[PDB]
Every structure is written in structure tokens, then in C-alpha cells.
């Protein structure tokens, strides 16, 4: 529960609260008690939502890709990275080493392509998702033995039920995850730099299980990020520039903040 | 590279307007529009990256304020949208005077202006 | 009796001494100490010098002049090729160790100015380019300081590290660094500002060649003024002492 | 065969929902924590500490340091004012990128007291006296020393200790305020004024710059999750 | 072997919770810890500095 | 339990129960017995479903909006307002201050339009649903970066699936809800006057996450509210005239009854 | 943890309720609070006033 | 698996109903109570004060 | 620890700091408070406002030169036309107050002077 | 008809999943064990013994 | 008839199982047997073999 | 839980841990404390999901 206000009164000592030196970088534990008069309230408000977990416990779309039942992209794959959007990395950001478990949810759509054919009585599509772990043997066509996924986790939806949900632990040789680091892959200081080189999380792949229909179709699948249990160390300054790439930190430089009349001006 | 984002606040400077081909690393720049000010801090520059993709953007100008609308003598003005670019105020009269009605903020050379003058009552 | 502006540290055969100080910053409130046998995942016994690689080592000297923008230091790349640390660090593949960071200016009662000395955890830099990414020598200075630039860096097929002060090269805001373990020298109250950080990482131990941890920003903030018949020349000083450090893993010197 | 119905709500995906679900890895051995220095538990906390705060956004100075230095210089008058901006630390661009306004753009209600700490960064020979005041709002700003000093203020004597903390209570009428612009949640209005002039002796600098910083109070608190203005995107990245 | 613990409810009843899944990563996430510690970032000194006291004497 | 009636008998006292003053305001407490000769009848009457719960507790469609897969109008949004519909609105009007959570229910139907493209075939629709708090990005677009929703709450629903359905608690910064307001916006009696400078609950957003089909398909959502944990204070009179406005309380003048032929009519 | 309580019958055989989710704005309606006081609006007076007595004496 | 069972009445949306239903702002602090004058709990309370009776209710 | 040369004093919703003071000189020794039951003579009952009467007003500033005489306050009247004190003492016949007087001057170390801060009573001229 | 609701990952078919299920012959009488040498209850048990290494893998 | 048994979590919290179907080929897995005996093909020789010793004397 | 590490020391004896024969087929029960000094760490890794039952429990 947040502190209560003191109730003070008029005072003539050699108390000086509000002088200080921020020089020793101390911020000042002063209350407004110190310098004025004030009464006594008690407060009943709560710092319930500020906290780590409530703050980052939100589902969030990290990418989302589009894959046929024709023609030439027959299956779609990506390179788990959480970069890939700006809010939820934003949010992620905020702190140097973080610890959570991941609650996966997954959204497929899919829609009729424009065509010719004649007769068109589709049926109800089934989807496949096969997540390869780093070393395992990626698909290289659509009807790969790969598919199999005996020791590889898989998930089968058909469409118009609920969307399908996972949860995956704290999946890391560290003993955090690190949404920042300052070294190279070599120990020569040379090759690549950045939080590029901590990544490896594995390839995820998306395919129709069937046909479904004479006709032409596109399904698009959304991937959405849940964490949950989540410990946090070392906070550091919200992203001021807008992000440019998924592997590096590279920027353009922007102004501290906007520009307004004058220096005694009550308005933006 | 495509075609630049199109921006509300800015437009392509020239002669990128006149341009069909950006090869990977191309920057090009904007201007603010009329009546829109520049805005300091940000950059009208984007870079087409290797991704065939160009570099987010932001609105790069801001809106022009016109002036005060200042003080009617025994009427009441109101502003329901602000002073800003292309806001509308309204010219009232108090009980017992008779009375434009509106006026409307509007780009009027480099800068805006009002574009009724007040009236009498 | 006593006054608390005067500050005496010793470590090893060194010893720094301060008659005007601010209080000393200790990191997150952690004192830096040893790895516990609960916490360890390396196997072979560790190696504590304890006396030579726990010293005072000093950097050189940078000149403070009214348009300085700043400097930088890589703390495991700064100590690299100075003493028995730097011999240390090099035939061992595994090390850990916290630093004490003391910078020191010194000026009259006429000259003013504000310095913010601040250690940064996993100081991620970016490139000029936003394609590509910045060049270990533009990135690691040795034996040298790293300057900030006043304006923006231009962008064209380089690997320049983006120097803008207003965004410390990592694009964030230079007033909200204070988040991570700081001081200010404002030079009409305090000569020196002392910061004694642990060890912070994500795994036990660390190679401290291919990964650096922490970095130090000294920013003048206002910048120095004086009127003429003054001293114009003002030095900064740096002094470095490694703490409770241990390495693993002997193997043939990396050069 | 249990006799079941099922409500409202099924087969629907909240967003911000509790529930259970089956691991995709079972029986997975996680790594062992261990002691890692400073443990963030609240978002409060973070907004306790100072942060710099860019006062002098006038112009390009928003493309320098300048933006945080405040001008103060000796002038052959008195009464004058240094600076003065509103209380809105979520919409005013004074406070909007400061660590607090960062952290508020992320909710939507904020209620407590501001803490500004004042710092002198001139000569070790000069002094000053100013006045440092709030006024709640009902009638705007003040535009004299002789208005503002009605308010609640501060009268900051320059010496050997260089800060001075100005506290900006709470006496807003609605229990918490909105962090965008509402006219309804007005704050008030923060200003500084010559109280003496500066005395500087001779061969000394006569023209000083303040700085300024700003942290959330104890009783701080924020009450409502949405998604910050500031963060923008055109198209994936990479 | 079921938990009952308070709801969040405003100032001025009780839930039940049981776990079916056996990888302590399944369970609904801690929405209820209300623990803070801000000495780490706000005086992080190594010298007790009192308030009324000069911070420089 | 309704107060059961007492038995009397016949009277020639000094006590005048009938006789009193209205001037004072008092409502008189006197029951048939007083008046009369009584018989003693157990009341098992029950006030149950006259209880301020009982009476705001049900749901009741405040707004419905119409979005399409194709043209302008991609997605719809709503400025949150309970004033929108009559019969809600009157009924709240019976207070002064309530303070409630809220239920709402969400209802989408779909509908194909009239169009010449030959071979539709569709498949299910997925719709979402996104609540922007004010001060939050607000979509410009219908592929819009903000429908990440990473803080902002979002549903998603399948057509063909159960109406979704969530809990709102009582969000508000004062200490009950404004059913009324007698002030400005401005401290200087000018601007915005009413219940309208009060009002301040985000805008709702809403929008088809597939296209579906080749042909053109117009979506309509209907918002149903359910007030529950209801608590009232001050009550006054319902709205004789018809409603005009939601931002204000303006009306057209109305009589105070309907007409009859004289003061002696037993009919309408 | 489960709350027993009677159910809304005819005058001249209790439910079993549990709690699911931990907000307490998620529960049910409180459908069953029969409590009155029209005191204040009916008799707001100062001075208390006797039925058979007269009004103004 | 617990083998269940769905009885007619089911995924239907009758408006007089009383359930439960997951929050959308989960630990969200409602702003304290406090004692306003003239609560009703009752809207019989409200039916038992005078009210003048328009008698006269005449042409115009 | 402490010094002796710092001083804050707190009245109403206003604050005064010091770093080069002397000590507080306190009237006749005697300490303001209010008016006792057994010393009275007037019979309604007071007003006591005791948070915007009590509270620092900030009069103007004057310049010191090298031929500067001096100034005078009649503090009654200086206060006469600011804040609520004003409009207390304007409605109001009869009034009874303490004053806490504070003057402040700013200089170097290469400037010198010294100046006299006096409270007279009755200072009929 | 007791009042339920359906959670996301309904009818959904993941293969790491632990879920009781009907049994297609009930009331089966399975062959009793017996005592069979070399029972593997660990993969690192077989991870422990000695194999061959082929060092000099060079062409053919 | 329920059983109540810990859960797998990290180093340095209890669920709940009931069986439905009658046939115990229908239960879940056992995914927590963590028992071990690798002397039965490591080391499987007839006379021990203490490890400072030599093999061969 | 698996086996945590023992710390050892020098030595100058007449054990000869690292000496063995295979020919007997043996597998020898060395550790790395045997032939080097070594920290004492405990570990707290764990065989889980290296057991026959996770191993072939999947679709
Ligand atoms: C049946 C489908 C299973 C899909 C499994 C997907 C597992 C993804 C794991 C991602 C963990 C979080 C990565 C964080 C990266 C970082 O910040 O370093
Ligand atoms: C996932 C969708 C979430 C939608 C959230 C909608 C929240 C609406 C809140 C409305 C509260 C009641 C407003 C009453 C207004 C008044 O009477 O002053």
C-alpha cells in the first residue's frame, strides 16, 4: 500500500531538509512534510499494476507470415527473434538481463486468391506448425520426410476452433536471457557484434496439411508472445531513436525532445 | 526500393518526385507542406536499407498556430478545435446586442491567418 | 574530530587520497567478492593473485577545453596491456572481477563547470551506416580515450561508430543515464568522484577479451568557463583498480 | 459424461487473460538462478530516481546539451523571471522523455507529489538567492514575482551545499490525474524568479547555468497499461 | 490439494486454485507480488546520509 | 419481507393520525388501519426485484457500427458513451452518482453484399477488436502497426464461435460516476459545458484480421453493457421530454401529462 | 473454499458457489441484498414528528 | 480428459444472466469509497415520497 | 554531524533557507502566541485563519549604493494590499499579529558594507 | 449443466502433450513381466560406456 | 480418490491427479521415474576393481 | 540430482587413478578431480528428460 502523509506543522530549527548535495548522486528522500504545512490523510492507493510481471504479462504479435496451397511458397518458416517489433521490444528493453517463461499463442486466417477456375466447393483446411530446434533437419520442400516430428514438437489446428495455445519454459544455456550484449562472436574481436551473436533460438515452419480446394488460397499465421514468471535486473534508458534493424542497435540520430516557444512558455 | 512513405505533415523534395529508381542506400529528403514548420529535432531523411525497405518515418512538421483570435467587445468567442491549422472559431453576441459568425484559420501567403475579421456588436 | 570530505583508499600497494569528496557510490549495493562453490560451473581451481591484479592502475591523462564533448573507456579493454592484470587476463580463457572507478579534475575557486561520471552495464554502440556494423578499433580504444562528437556522424559505406553525445551512441537519452551507478564533479564542490562497482553478467564467468562488460562516460554537462589569466589547461585523470579477481582455464597467451 | 454448458467467452483469445496451458516441452530442466546486482521488483522504483530534465528546449538546442542548461546571469535589475513550464509530466515536453514521463506515457492515470532538485554549476565565488514556486491552477500563470509569490515556494540560498529540492505536493481535487492533455485534470503552473541578483567578484564569470532534475515521490502511483505515443513502425525490421 | 487465496478488491472474497499440468511452466502467471526494495537505485551510497543533516560537513 | 397489516377496531380519541402538515415536507407514515377498521393478514410480499441491482442489472445494446473487407470504410471505431441509446440512458438517469463494474458483451454478424464476381468461396472470418485508452495511438490505417495491442487489450473471434464476452472494473479518477454535470471545462466559466467535459473512456476500435473471400463482405458489431456491484446515490426525477443530443442535455418543451375531457373523466 | 448460501424460493435448497478468477470485479452480481432505509428521504426532518400528535402545535 | 457432457442451452447469449467472465484490466485499483448523502438501496425507497398529481389535466 | 550557520523556517505553505546566518533574534524574549481568556476585553469571537495570513510575503527589492542613506517599513501598511492578509485587516475593526521580519543581501568576498536591521515600536516621526 | 468455459488451445493436437483417453480394449489381460538382464532406465547409462573413436578418418 | 504430487521446477509447487477410466492403460505417462544403474554395462566384471589400485597385478 | 565436483589437491603418492586396463572391458570411474586440482562446486543439473520414458514419449 503506498505511505500515508505526515501531518507538520511550523518549524524555526537548523533542520535543513531540502538542501542537499546531488553531487554524491543520492536523490533526495525529502516529503512535501519538510517544507510546508500539511495534514494528515491516509492513502489507500496501491502500486499493484507498477509491478514487473502485470507490466509485462500482456500478449503482443512479434511477426506474422503469409504461406499457399499453390504455386511456389508452399510453407512458410521464421528465425525466433523478438526484434522483430518495436513495442514489445520496447517493452522487453527496458532492462539489461531478464528471466520469464513464454506463453505461445497462435492465429491463422486464411483467404480465397482471385482466379478462374470454375466448381469451386472448398473444404475445411488443417495446419500444421513444426518448431526445429538449432541442429535439427529444416524442411526443404512441403512434403518432407521432415514432417514427421518425432522427437520435434508439433501442432495440428483446423480452422474454425479456438486458436492453438502452448507454454514453453526458460529456454537458455545462460542463466538469463540478454536483451544486450557488448562482444563479438570470435575471441579475436572480430566477426559478428552485437546481441546477434547470443541468439539461437531455432527455425519454426508452417504448412497445409491439405489441398482443401481446386482453387487458390493464402493462410497467414500470427505469432503472440505472452511472458509470464518474470524476474528483471539492471534497468537502463527507453529507446529515444526509432529502430532500424532486428540484429543490431544501429540508429539515426534524433533530438532529446520538441521544441517549444520560449523558455517561459506554459504551452507545447 | 518502391516509391518513399507518403507523410501527411511533409512532401518529397524535388527532384526525387521525378524519380522511379532507388538503389539499396539511397537517402532522400522531404519538406514541410503548407502551412506545416519544421520540426527541429527530427530529420527528413530516409535510406532505402538492403531489405528493399525504407527507414521508418516520422511526421517530420507540425501544424502552423494562427495568431490569438483576440477579444470581441460584448461578444463571446468559442473555440471548440483550437488555434491550429484549419481550426474553425465562433463569433457570438451577448443578450440585448445584435451582430461574421465563424472564421476560419487558413494559409494566407507564408503564414496563417484568420480568415473573417470580427465583427460588430 | 572528524570531517567526511576527506577519503583515504588502499589496495594493494597503492593508495588514493581526497580532501574534497562526495560520498562513495558502491554499485547496486553489492561490495564485489569471490564466487561461491554454490554458484560456480567451472570445474579446475581458480587462480587469486589478489595483491598485483588489485592495484590502482593509472590511465592517461585527457585535456578538458571549453568544447569538449566527452570521452569513453572500455574497462576489461582499458586494463588490458597494463601490469600483471593484462598478463593475467591473457593466458587465462575464464575471468571475474569488479572495478573501483576514481576520476579526479582539478581547478580553482574561479573556474566552473559539471562533469557526470557514470559506469554502463552492456554499452551496445551503433554504426554511421545503419547497414553493417561498427569496426573494433572505431569501437575498443587502448591505451587511449574514445571522444564523443558534437555533431551527427555522416553515413556512407563506413564502419564509424555514430558518436552523437546527445544520444551516447546507443540512441538513448544522455539526462537518463543516471539510472546506472553515477556521480557529478562540479567543480565548485567536489574535486574527485569515486564509483566501486561489482561484477554484473548474465553467466559466472566471462572471457574478457571478446566480451566487455561495463563502460565508463565522463560528459561535461555545462561546460568549463574561466576568465582570462586563468590556468587553460585542465586535466582529467582516471584510476582503475581490479577487485577480488579469479581466472580459469591456463592456456597458451592470446596476443 | 458430466452435464456441462458452456457460457458466453468460448473459444474468444483475450489478450490480458490467467490461464493454464499444456508445456510443448515437458519435463524440461531450467538452468539455476543466481545473485544478479539490482533486482528490479517495481517500475516505482525506477521512477524514484533523478533524470535530467530538458528545460531549455527552445529551438535547435534540442540538438546539444544546451537543452538542459539553464541561463542564470547577473543583469542590472530584479524580480525577473528564469523559467517556468506547467505541471503535466505525461504531456508537456518538458517531462515527457524524462525517465518519470517515459514511464508514465506507458499508463493512462497518475496521482502523488513531484520532487525538483535544483543544482548550481557556477563559480566557487558566486551567490545567488531565487525563489522557486507552484501555483495550483484557477488563474494562469503568474507574470510577477509578487504573484508567484502566493503560491507555494522555496527561497534557495546559493552556498556550500549547491541543491535545493522544491516539493510539488498533491492538491488535486480528483484522486488520480490524466496523463494526457485534459483540461478538466489541470495541474498548475512552475516558475523561478530572481530573488536578490547575482553578486560575482572580480576576474569571475558573471553568467551561470542551473540544472534540474526530477523523481517521483512515496506515495507516486500510476493505474492503467496502454501502448507509449513515442514507438512507431512503417514495416517489419530486418 | 486446492489454494484459496484473497482477490484483489478496492479499500474503504477469496478464489480457489488447483494445478493440472506437472511442469511448474503451465501454471497462471504472479500477479500478486507486491514487493519493493528501492535502496539499490535511490541511495546507493556507502555512507549514510540523514536528512536533516548537510550532505557535506 | 413486506410489513404485514395490524388489525383495529373502531375509535373516538383525541388522536388525529390523518390530519398534518405537508408544509413541513414530512411524508405522512400512516397505513389503512388508522383510517378504518383492519383485519390482522400475514404480507408475504417480497421486495426482491425492486432492488437497485435487480433493476440496472441487465444487458442492453448501447451502439452497433457497420465495417467492410473492401473500399473505404476498413475498420470502425467508437467513442465510448453510454448516452448513445435511450433506455439505458433513462434508466441510469434515475441518479445522480452510481459507482458499477461493467459486462460487456460483444455480438458480430456478417453479411455478403451485392457485387458480379463470379466462383465466392469464402472461408471463416476472424475478426478483433482493440480498446485504445486515451492518450494511445490510435489506428490511422487498417494495417496499422498499433493492432500489435503488445499493452493496449485486444479480443479475437472466429465467427461461428460464442459471442465474446470480458469484465470491465469501475474505471474512473473520482470517487463515483457523473450521471450529471454542472460546470466548464475552463476555470473561467467558458467552453465545453456539461457532462461532456466528465466524459473521457477511450475510443473502441474494430476490424476484419482476413479478407475471406473475393467478393465483398460488410461485418456489423453490436456492444451490449450489463452494470453489476451497482451503487447509487441521490435520485431524481426520469426524463419527461424525448432525448436529442449525447453530448447534452437540450430538449424540445412538452406538456407535463396527456388530455382528458374533464375533471370528472374515468377515461382516457 | 466454497461459499453455501439459500436460494430464492416461494414463501407458505441453497447453491454452492466457488470463485475462478482473482480480480473480484470478474464475480457475479450481488443480486441478493434486501436492505432499506427510506428514512432520509421520506421524514428528512429535524425535529421528529408523532403520527397521532398534531404537525404544527 | 474428464469425460463432460453439453447440454442444450449452450454458446447462447441470454441477456438476464449471471456468470463469471475474465477481467480485461487485471489488478487494477479501484479508487477508495467514500460517504455521499442519500444512497439508495432500494427503489421503493423512491416510490414512497409525495409527488404532486397533475388532477387538472384539462385541454391545455 | 551539524553547523551553525544553516538555518529553514517553515510558515503556512512557504519556506526559507539560509547558509550564512547569524542567530534569531527573538523580540523581548517573548515567543508570538494568541490572546488568553483573562486578557481580553472584546466579547464576539475571533477569526483565525492561521494558514494564508500566516504565511512569508515578499515585498519589493532595493538596490544598494555607495551613497545609499537607508530605508524604513511600516509593516501594518506594507502588507496592507497583499494576499488574504489584506482583505482580513480590511473587512475586519479590531487585529492582533506577531511579525517574523527576514532581509536578505547577496554579495562576494571582495565586496564589504554593513548594514543595520532594526524593529522599532511606535516610531512616530 | 454446469456452467463452463473454453479456454484458447481447444481441439488442438500437440504432440508433447500427457491427456488420459479412452481405452479401444477394455478389460485387457496383458502378459505378466519377467525378469529380463540389462534393463535401461537412464539414455546417460548408455552414454557411459566406452566406443571406438575413429580418429584417423582421413579419405578412404 | 485424488493424488497429490510436486511438480518439475527450477533450482535454487504441488498438483493434482485423479484417474477416470477404469483400465490403468489409459493413465498418463510417467515422466518422473528418475532412478539409475549404470553398473550393470559399465563395469560388469565378476571381481572388483578399486580405481587407485592397479587393474593388472 | 546429478553428481557435484569435489575439490582435491596436490599429490605425490603411489594411487595411480588415471593407470587402468581395457582389456578387461572395465569402463573406469575417473573423475576430473583424479588428475588435476579441482574447485568444490554443487551441481544442480538434473538427468530428466534424458529417461527412456521422455525419450520415446512423443507422436
Ligand atoms: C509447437 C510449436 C512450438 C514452438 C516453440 C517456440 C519456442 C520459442 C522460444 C523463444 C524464447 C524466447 C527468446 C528470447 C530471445 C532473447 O531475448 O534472447
Ligand atoms: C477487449 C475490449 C475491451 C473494451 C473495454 C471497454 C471499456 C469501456 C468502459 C466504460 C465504463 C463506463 C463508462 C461510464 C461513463 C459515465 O457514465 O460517465
Known amino acids: ?268 | ?121 | ?255 | 459424461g458430466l452435464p456441462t454448458m458452456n457460457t458466453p467467452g468460448s473459444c474468444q483469445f483475450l489478450t490480458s487473460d490467467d490461464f493454464q496451458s499444456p508445456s510443448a516441452m515437458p519435463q524440461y530442466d531450467v538452468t539455476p538462478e543466481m545473485k544478479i546486482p539490482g533486482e528490479v521488483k517495481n517500475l516505482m522504483e525506477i521512477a524514484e530516481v533523478d533524470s535530467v530534465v530538458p528545460v531549455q528546449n527552445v529551438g535547435e538546442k534540442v540538438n546539444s546539451m544546451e537543452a538542459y542548461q539553464i541561463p542564470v546571469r547577473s543583469n542590472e535589475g530584479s524580480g525577473t523571471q528564469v523559467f517556468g513550464f506547467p505541471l503535466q509530466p505525461g504531456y508537456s515536453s518538458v517531462f515527457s522523455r524524462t525517465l518519470l514521463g517515459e514511464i508514465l506515457n506507458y499508463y493512462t492515470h497518475w496521482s502523488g507529489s513531484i520532487k525538483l532538485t535544483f543544482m548550481f554549476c557556477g563559480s566557487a565565488m558566486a551567490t545567488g538567492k531565487f525563489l522557486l514556486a507552484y501555483s495550483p491552477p484557477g488563474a494562469g500563470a503568474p507574470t510577477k514575482r509578487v504573484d508567484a509569490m502566493l503560491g507555494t515556494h522555496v527561497v534557495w540560498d546559493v552556498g556550500l551545499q549547491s541543491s535545493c529540492v522544491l516539493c510539488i505536493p498533491w492538491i488535486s481535487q480528483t484522486h488520480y490525474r490524466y496523463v494526457a492533455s485534459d483540461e478538466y485534470t489541470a495541474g498548475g503552473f512552475i516558475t523561478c524568479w530572481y530573488q536578490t541578483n547575482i553578486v560575482v567578484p572580480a576576474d569571475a564569470q558573471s553568467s551561470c547555468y542551473i540544472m534540474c532534475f526530477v523523481s517521483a515521490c512515496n506515495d507516486f502511483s500510476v493505474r492503467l497499461l496502454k501502448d507509449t505515443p513515442f514507438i512507431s513502425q512503417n514495416s517489419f525490421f530486418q | ?57
Not at chain 1, 78 to 100: D, G, H, S
Not at chain 2, 79 to 103: D, R
Not at chain 3, 58 to 72: A, I, R
Not at chain 3, 189 to 205: D, K, Q
Request: charged share 15%.
Open chain 1, 1 to 268: 500500500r503506498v505511505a500515508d502523509t505526515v501531518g507538520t506543522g511550523p518549524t524555526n530549527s537548523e533542520a535543513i531538509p531540502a538542501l542537499t548535495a546531488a553531487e554524491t548522486g543520492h536523490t533526495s528522500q525529502v516529503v512535501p512534510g519538510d517544507t510546508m504545512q500539511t495534514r494528515h490523510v491516509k492513502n489507500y492507493h496501491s502500486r499493484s499494476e507498477s509491478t514487473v510481471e502485470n507490466f509485462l504479462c500482456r500478449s503482443a504479435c512479434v511477426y506474422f507470415t503469409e504461406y499457399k496451397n499453390s504455386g511456389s511458397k508452399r510453407y512458410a518458416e521464421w528465425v525466433v527473434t523478438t526484434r522483430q517489433a518495436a513495442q514489445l521490444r520496447r517493452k522487453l528493453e527496458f532492462f539489461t538481463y531478464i528471466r520469464f517463461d513464454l506463453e505461445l499463442t497462435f492465429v491463422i486466417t486464411s483467404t480465397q486468391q482471385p482466379s478462374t477456375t470454375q466448381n469451386q466447393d472448398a473444404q475445411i483446411l488443417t495446419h500444421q506448425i513444426m518448431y526445429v530446434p538449432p541442429g535439427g533437419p529444416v524442411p526443404d520442400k512441403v512434403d518432407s520426410y521432415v514432417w514427421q516430428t518425432s522427437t520435434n514438437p508439433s501442432v495440428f489446428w483446423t480452422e474454425g476452433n479456438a486458436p492453438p495455445r502452448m507454454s514453453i519454459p526458460f529456454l537458455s544455456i545462460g542463466n538469463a536471457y540478454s536483451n544486450f550484449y557488448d562482444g563479438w562472436s570470435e575471441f579475436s574481436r572480430n566477426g559478428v557484434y552485437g546481441i546477434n551473436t547470443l541468439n539461437n533460438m531455432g527455425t519454426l515452419y508452417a504448412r497445409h496439411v491439405n489441398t482443401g480446394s481446386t482453387g487458390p488460397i493464402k493462410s497467414t499465421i500470427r505469432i503472440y508472445f505472452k511472458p509470464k514468471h518474470v524476474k528483471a535486473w539492471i534497468p537502463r534508458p527507453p529507446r529515444l531513436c526509432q529502430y532500424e534493424k532486428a540484429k543490431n542497435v544501429n540508429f539515426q540520430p534524433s533530438g532529446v525532445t520538441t521544441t517549444r516557444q520560449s523558455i517561459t512558455t506554459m504551452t507545447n
Open chain 3, 1 to 255: 574530530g572528524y570531517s567526511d570530505r576527506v577519503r583515504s583508499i588502499t589496495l594493494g600497494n597503492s593508495t588514493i587520497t581526497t580532501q574534497e569528496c562526495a560520498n562513495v557510490v558502491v554499485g547496486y549495493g553489492v561490495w564485489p567478492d569471490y564466487l561461491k562453490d554454490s554458484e560456480a560451473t567451472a570445474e579446475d581451481q581458480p587462480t587469486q593473485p589478489d595483491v598485483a591484479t588489485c592495484r590502482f592502475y593509472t590511465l592517461d591523462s585527457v585535456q578538458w577545453q571549453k568544447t569538449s564533448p566527452g570521452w569513453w573507456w572500455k574497462l576489461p579493454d582499458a586494463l588490458s596491456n597494463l601490469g600483471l592484470f593484462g598478463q593475467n587476463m591473457q593466458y587465462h580463457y575464464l575471468g571475474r572481477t569488479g572495478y573501483t572507478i576514481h576520476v579526479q579534475c582539478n581547478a580553482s575557486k574561479f573556474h566552473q563547470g559539471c562533469l557526470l561520471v557514470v559506469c554502463v552495464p552492456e554499452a551496445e554502440m551503433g554504426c554511421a551506416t545503419l547497414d553493417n556494423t561498427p569496426s573494433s578499433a572505431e569501437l575498443l580504444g587502448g591505451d587511449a580515450a574514445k571522444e564523443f562528437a558534437g555533431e551527427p556522424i555522416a553515413s556512407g559505406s563506413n564502419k564509424l561508430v555514430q558518436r552523437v553525445v546527445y544520444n551516447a551512441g546507443m540512441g538513448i537519452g544522455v539526462g537518463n543515464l543516471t539510472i546506472f551507478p553515477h556521480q557529478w564533479i562540479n567543480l565548485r564542490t567536489n574535486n574527485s568522484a569515486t564509483i566501486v562497482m561489482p561484477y554484473t553478467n548474465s553467466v559466472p564467468m566471462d572471457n574478457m577479451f571478446r566480451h566487455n562488460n561495463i563502460t565508463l562516460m565522463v560528459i561535461p554537462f555545462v561546460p568549463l568557463d574561466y576568465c582570462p589569466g586563468s590556468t587553460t589547461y585542465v586535466p582529467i585523470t582516471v584510476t582503475i583498480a581490479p577487485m577480488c579477481a579469479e581466472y580459469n582455464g591456463l592456456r597458451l597467451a592470446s596476443h
Open chain 5, 1 to 57: 490439494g486446492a489454494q484459496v487465496s484473497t482477490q484483489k478488491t478496492g479499500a474503504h472474497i477469496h478464489y480457489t486454485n488447483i494445478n493440472y499440468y506437472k511442469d511448474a511452466a503451465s501454471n497462471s502467471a504472479t500477479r500478486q507480488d507486491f514487493a519493493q526494495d528501492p535502496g539499490k537505485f535511490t541511495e546507493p551510497v556507502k555512507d549514510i546520509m540523514i536528512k536533516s543533516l548537510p550532505a557535506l560537513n
Open chain 2, 1 to 121: 526500393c518502391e516509391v518513399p512513405t507518403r507523410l501527411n505533415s511533409a512532401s518529397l523534395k524535388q527532384p526525387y518526385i521525378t524519380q522511379n529508381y532507388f538503389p539499396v542506400g539511397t537517402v532522400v529528403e522531404y519538406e514541410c507542406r503548407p502551412g506545416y514548420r519544421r520540426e527541429p529535432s527530427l530529420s527528413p531523411k530516409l535510406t532505402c536499407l538492403q531489405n528493399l525497405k525504407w527507414s521508418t518515418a516520422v511526421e517530420f512538421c507540425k501544424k502552423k498556430s494562427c495568431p490569438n483570435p483576440g477579444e470581441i467587445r460584448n461578444g463571446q468567442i468559442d473555440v471548440p478545435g483550437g488555434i491550429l491549422f484549419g481550426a474553425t472559431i465562433s463569433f457570438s453576441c451577448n443578450t440585448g446586442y445584435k451582430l461574421s459568425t465563424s472564421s476560419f484559420c487558413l494559409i494566407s501567403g507564408s503564414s496563417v491567418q484568420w480568415s473573417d475579421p470580427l465583427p460588430e456588436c
